[PDB]
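A quick word before the example. In earlier lectures we treated sequence and structure as two separate objects. From today on, think of them as two lines of the same record. Here is Bromodomain-containing protein 1 written that way.
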Amino acid sequence: SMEQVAMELRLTELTRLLRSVLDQLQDKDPARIFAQPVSLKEVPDYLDHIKHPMDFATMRKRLEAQGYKNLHEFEEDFDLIIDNCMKYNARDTVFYRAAVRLRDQGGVVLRQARREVDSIG
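And the structure line, produced from the sequence above:
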């Protein structure tokens, strides 16, 4: 139907905007701490601690399959990256501290993304 096409164009355009959002958030991680999944070869107990692992590469796979229906879903995955790290790693670590800085700097990007998503519809 023509309606289904219009919906699909809306999803495509959301995906475009989320791709730009993702690029901007990932620039706030210049150390690449969050770029890839935590390795279960290197951290064998990880899934005992963290039930829903997340990372920027996993988000990008979902994004490119158009698997985010709205900004809420995308933000849920970004918050998992941060929140998982702040639980597994202690306050005095470069990993925790990187997550705090990513959360703080990302907030700015996400605030305007929400306005754009609402504005453009």
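Notice the following. The two ends are 21 Å apart (CA to CA). We will return to this example when we discuss secondary structure assignment.
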